[PDB]
Structures are given as C-alpha cells and as structure tokens.
Design a protein around this motif. Structure first.
Motif, PDB file in Angstrom:
ATOM      1  N   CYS A 249       0.973  -1.133  -0.099  1.00  0.00           N
ATOM      2  CA  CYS A 249       0.150   0.094  -0.047  1.00  0.00           C
ATOM      3  C   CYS A 249       0.930   1.151   0.007  1.00  0.00           C
ATOM      4  N   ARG A 250       0.591   2.451  -0.745  1.00  0.00           N
ATOM      5  CA  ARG A 250       1.298   3.736  -0.818  1.00  0.00           C
ATOM      6  C   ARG A 250       0.161   4.778  -1.088  1.00  0.00           C
ATOM      7  N   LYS A 251      -0.200   5.628  -0.324  1.00  0.00           N
ATOM      8  CA  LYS A 251      -1.247   6.870  -0.393  1.00  0.00           C
ATOM      9  C   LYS A 251      -2.609   6.432  -0.851  1.00  0.00           C
ATOM     10  N   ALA A 252      -2.685   5.983  -2.193  1.00  0.00           N
ATOM     11  CA  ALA A 252      -3.848   5.516  -2.939  1.00  0.00           C
ATOM     12  C   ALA A 252      -4.359   4.179  -2.431  1.00  0.00           C
ATOM     13  N   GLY A 253      -5.401   3.649  -2.717  1.00  0.00           N
ATOM     14  CA  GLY A 253      -5.797   2.281  -2.419  1.00  0.00           C
ATOM     15  C   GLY A 253      -5.537   1.206  -3.040  1.00  0.00           C
ATOM     16  N   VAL A 254      -4.364   1.048  -3.572  1.00  0.00           N
ATOM     17  CA  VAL A 254      -3.815   0.278  -4.712  1.00  0.00           C
ATOM     18  C   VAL A 254      -2.084   0.107  -4.620  1.00  0.00           C
TER      19      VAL A 254
ATOM     20  N   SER B 109     -10.228   9.996  -5.957  1.00  0.00           N
ATOM     21  CA  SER B 109     -11.221   9.401  -5.392  1.00  0.00           C
ATOM     22  C   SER B 109     -12.519  10.011  -6.187  1.00  0.00           C
TER      23      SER B 109
END
Length: 19
Positions: free
Chosen positions: A1-6, A19
């Motif tokens: 995981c890294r900032k974004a949900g991906v 978003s």
C-alpha cells in the motif's frame, strides 16, 4: 500500500483518479 488504495499497481509513472 502507498497513499492511494492500490499503491501504483497499474502501468506506472504519474497515476490518476484520486477519489
């Protein structure tokens, strides 16, 4: 995981859709 949900699991170098 890294900032974004991906975490850059697409084509890579400057992603989109926050978003």
């Amino acid at each position: 995981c890294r900032k974004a949900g991906v975490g850059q699991s697409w084509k890579e170098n400057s992603p989109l859709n926050v978003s």
